[PDB]
């Protein structure tokens, strides 16, 4: 419904495909030896790159540049882990460039504990059967980044004033493309709680990695402390 949603939606869809991952980074999932060392480095590169495309994508979300500035950093630092999941989920499920079956092994031998690899791909498979469209991936990303519930937020109501419209547009989209089962909107929103569970375990993977001398880029260090 409404035309004003289209002015808000497609402009978000403008930003969601403005930048893909550079070919200079994706092609080494193929070209280079499958070492536990180089596996981690490639993943570091892509994670490094993805923080950049997210900051640009969020910088355009309507009303983001108007928020307080000590809170936008808390928005980014609290959502970067989860938004990287959505994009890599869209890659694994659509099987796009991402080199799915080869990227997954490079992930499976990067020093990650087995108790974190199992629930990770169970998520990947589960969110694949949802047969989600690109606009659903794009909005869910916007809603995750603009989460008023994040840690060290001061003006929590300000975030709600910009997350609320995008939530209504999305449920008004499970109106058109699926009128058969009204629960699809509640099924996409479950994923955002799934991602929160992962954000808990991700802090553990990080400390396990640097225990073992895994240097990150300066920017991942800043966004994960």
């Amino acid at each position: 419904l409404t035309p004003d949603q289209q002015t808000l939606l497609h402009f978000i869809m403008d930003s969601y495909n403005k930048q893909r991952m550079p070919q200079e980074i994706t092609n080494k999932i193929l070209k280079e030896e499958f070492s536990a060392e180089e596996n981690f480095l490639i993943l570091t590169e892509m994670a490094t790159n993805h923080v950049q495309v997210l900051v640009e994508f969020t910088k355009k979300l309507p009303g983001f540049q108007t928020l307080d500035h000590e809170d936008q950093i808390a928005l980014l630092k609290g959502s970067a882990v989860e938004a990287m999941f959505l994009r890599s989920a869209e890659i694994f499920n659509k099987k796009l460039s991402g080199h799915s079956d080869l990227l997954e092994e490079r992930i499976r031998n990067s020093g990650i504990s087995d108790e974190y690899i199992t629930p990770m791909f169970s998520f990947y498979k589960s969110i694949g059967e949802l047969k989600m469209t690109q606009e659903e991936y794009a909005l869910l990303t916007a809603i995750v980044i603009l989460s008023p519930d994040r840690q060290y937020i001061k003006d929590r109501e300000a975030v709600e004033k910009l997350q609320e419209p995008l939530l209504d547009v999305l449920q008004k989209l499970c109106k058109i493309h699926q009128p058969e089962n009204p629960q699809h909107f509640a099924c996409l929103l479950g994923r955002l709680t799934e991602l929160r569970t992962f954000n808990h375990h991700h802090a553990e993977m990080l400390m396990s990695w640097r225990v073992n001398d895994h240097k990150f880029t300066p920017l991942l260090c800043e966004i994960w402390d």
């Binding site: 900051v55 640009e56 910088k59 500035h69 630092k77 300066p218 920017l219 800043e222």
Partner: peptide, 11 residues
């Protein structure tokens, strides 16, 4: 203190 995040939010 959020040196690099603030730089990309202003580029």
């Amino acid at each position: 203190e959020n040196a690099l995040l603030r730089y990309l939010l202003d580029k």
